[PDB]
Structure formats: structure tokens, C-alpha cells
Enzyme design. Structure first.
Site, PDB file in Angstrom:
ATOM      1  N   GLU A  73       0.816  -1.196   0.000  1.00 17.21           N
ATOM      2  CA  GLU A  73       0.000   0.000   0.000  1.00 17.21           C
ATOM      3  C   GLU A  73       0.869   1.274   0.000  1.00 17.21           C
ATOM      4  OE1 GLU A  73      -3.063   0.120  -0.578  1.00 17.21           O
ATOM      5  OE2 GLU A  73      -3.863  -1.857  -0.133  1.00 17.21           O
ATOM      6  N   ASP A 121      -6.016   8.335  -4.333  1.00 19.11           N
ATOM      7  CA  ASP A 121      -5.706   7.034  -4.885  1.00 19.11           C
ATOM      8  C   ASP A 121      -5.782   7.068  -6.390  1.00 19.11           C
ATOM      9  OD1 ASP A 121      -8.391   7.112  -5.418  1.00 19.11           O
ATOM     10  OD2 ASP A 121      -8.967   5.349  -4.236  1.00 19.11           O
TER      11      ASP A 121
END
Length: 164
Positions: A11, A20
Site C-alpha cells: 500500500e 488514490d
């Protein structure tokens, strides 16, 4: 070597709100905040969570703090899933996390689709569970981490996070 630092490799770790792939405000270790374009809505939800006017910037500690709950929500979902639980139980420590990683990224349901590979794993069919894995939508989106996970399933050592 530890559940936190393993997902850091994947991540990644951000101590400031960012967006994101699809443009979502998120912080720390893939923690999502809001789907709304608000920049003032993310900070808000950030303070609500941390419990302090962070001004959209957190400390390392606060990340792990959010991390553990993100991780429990992953486990809790597995525990309450008829298809993963068994598989989960059957696994060793090193492979339990490869299991939790997919649920961290895909989700309780999504990972509950790979019945092909789900079964082979429970059956200790490493080399072959790894195969149906490769042929997957997942593998082709984030092949970078995906092929890292698959190896830790294949072997049972967290070596794939030892070169990267």
C-alpha cells in the site's frame, strides 16, 4: 517481518492526505477517507478518526493506529466468511498475512471469489494455487504486489519483501 511493514511495501505509507488511483482522498496505509471531491470533508473525517485537528497530516503512530483497525476489519470479515475462514485456519503465520493482504486490498467478498485457488491453498496446493492466481483480474491490475503475495503463498517465507 511484521504485518505493518509488509503492507507498507504494498500500500505504501503516506503521512498526508492524498488521492488514490480513482482520485480518492486517503492517508497513511491505504486508508480511505471519503469518495466525495471535498478536501474539507477528508480532513474532517480525518480529525474525527484521529480525534484532533491534524490539518490533514498525521504521525507515523496515528497511521498504525488506523492500520490495526483496517487490519481487524480485514480479519473480522475473514472470520465471518464461510469460504476464507477454513482456508485461513489451515494456513501458517507467514501465509495468514498473504491471506489478509488480499482482503485488505480486494475485500471480504472479492477475495471470496477465488474458490479455484481458495481450495488448492487449504489443500496445501501451493505451486498450483499460485497458478490459478496468476491468471486473474487482480494479478493484472496490481501485478507488482500480486506476484509478491503469490510467492509468499508459494514458499511460506516473506522473502519477496526482502528484495523490494
Amino acid at each position: 517481518m511484521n504485518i505493518f511493514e509488509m503492507l507498507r511495501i504494498d500500500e505504501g505509507l503516506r503521512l498526508k492526505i492524498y488521492k488514490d488511483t480513482e482520485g480518492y482522498y486517503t492517508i497513511g496505509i491505504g486508508h480511505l477517507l471519503t469518495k466525495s471531491p471535498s478536501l474539507n470533508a477528508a480532513k474532517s473525517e480525518l480529525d474525527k478518526a484521529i480525534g484532533r485537528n491534524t490539518n490533514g497530516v498525521i504521525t507515523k503512530d496515528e497511521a498504525e493506529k488506523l492500520f490495526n483497525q483496517d487490519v481487524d476489519a480485514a480479519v473480522r470479515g475473514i472470520l465471518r466468511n464461510a469460504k476464507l475462514k477454513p482456508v485461513y485456519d489451515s494456513l501458517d503465520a507467514v501465509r495468514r498475512a498473504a491471506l489478509i493482504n488480499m482482503v485488505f486490498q480486494m475485500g471480504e467478498t472479492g477475495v471470496a471469489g477465488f474458490t479455484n485457488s481458495l481450495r488448492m491453498l487449504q489443500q496445501k496446493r501451493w505451486d498450483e494455487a499460485a497458478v490459478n492466481l496468476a491468471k486473474s483480474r487482480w494479478y493484472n491490475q496490481t501485478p507488482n504486489r500480486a506476484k509478491r503475495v503469490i510467492t509468499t503463498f508459494r514458499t511460506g517465507t516473506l522473502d519477496a519483501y526482502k528484495n523490494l
